[PDB]
Amino acid sequence: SKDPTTFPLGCSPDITTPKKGLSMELYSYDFRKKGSYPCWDAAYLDPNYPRTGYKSHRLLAKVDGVTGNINFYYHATKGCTPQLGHLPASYNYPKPLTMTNFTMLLYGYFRPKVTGFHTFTISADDLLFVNFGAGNAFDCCRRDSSADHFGNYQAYAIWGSKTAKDELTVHLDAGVYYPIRLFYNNREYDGALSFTFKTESNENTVSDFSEYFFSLDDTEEGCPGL
Numbered sequence: 001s002k003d004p005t006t007f008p009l010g011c012s013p014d015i016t017t018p019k020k021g022l023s024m025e026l027y028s029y030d031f032r033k034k035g036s037y038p039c040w041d042a043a044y045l046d047p048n049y050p051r052t053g054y055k056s057h058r059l060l061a062k063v064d065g066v067t068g069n070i071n072f073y074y075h076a077t078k079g080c081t082p083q084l085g086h087l088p089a090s091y092n093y094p095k096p097l098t099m100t101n102f103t104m105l106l107y108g109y110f111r112p113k114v115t116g117f118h119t120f121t122i123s124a125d126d127l128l129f130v131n132f133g134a135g136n137a138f139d140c141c142r143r144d145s146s147a148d149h150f151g152n153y154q155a156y157a158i159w160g161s162k163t164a165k166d167e168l169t170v171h172l173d174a175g176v177y178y179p180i181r182l183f184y185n186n187r188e189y190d191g192a193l194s195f196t197f198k199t200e201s202n203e204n205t206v207s208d209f210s211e212y213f214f215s216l217d218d219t220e221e222g223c224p225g226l
């Protein structure tokens with residue numbers, strides 16, 4: 001149920017109009033004390049960090065309606081220094097934040113337009129961990145109760161690996177709502193996130209998620225498929 005799979009389970013909500021976009025939570029991420037070498041904290045790679053550790057830091061912002069092109073590259077100018085900047089407009093959060101050092105959680109549902117094999121390509125500085133599918137990300141219209149219980153990642157990218165890029169090929173059904181969780185961190189300096197996909201049905205890369213990302217209310221019974 002929770003394991004990654006090429007045939008992720010999806011959801012069938014009883015809702016005539018879903019809400020556009022994913023939800024986002026932003027969290028602080030500190031450097032180690034001055035005189036530390038390296039200056040940055042390796043906590044971001046603690047195995048618990050994407051599940052619980054990120055919540056030991058300050059919740060900075062919680063917003064809805066994240067969609068469009070969510071890709072970014074923040075070029076820092078100084079090492080081992082908090083520097084302010086902005087997320088792209090697509091994130092619905094125009095306040096400044098420490099773009100050199102922060103954590104971001106996105107969640108909601110991906111609804112495909114076509115049926116078939118989708119190949120998602122991701123890259124990140126410093127990390128992007130992706131869950132995708134009911135159970136693997138969270139349970140259908142039962143997100144609040146299953147949010148902390150995601151399974152092993154469907155895809156991940158870590159700066160400093162051999163390549164810092166990953167693919168995920170999954171077969172999806174058009175119009176089905178698939179639970180998705182993105183977890184991002186910048187430890188220091190530059191920060192970057194790339195999230196795009198292709199399908200077998202044409203050669204174009206999709207980078208604008210405007211009619212693909214949705215939010216659904218939880219219900220007592222949930223909204224499983226099949």
Ligand SMILES: CC(=O)N[C@@H]1[C@@H](O[C@@H]2O[C@H](CO)[C@H](O)[C@H](O)[C@H]2O)[C@@H](O)[C@@H](CO)O[C@H]1O
Pocket residue numbers: 038040078079080125126159187188189190191
């Ligand atoms: C490996 C390392 O410590 N590099 C320093 C730079 O910081 C890293 O930058 C990479 C991207 O190149 C990445 O964002 C990583 O998260 C950062 O830790 C930077 O501080 C630079 C300043 O001149 O020095 C490098 O040594």
Ligand SMILES: [Ca+2]
Pocket residue numbers: 125126186187188189190191
């Ligand atoms: Ca970085």
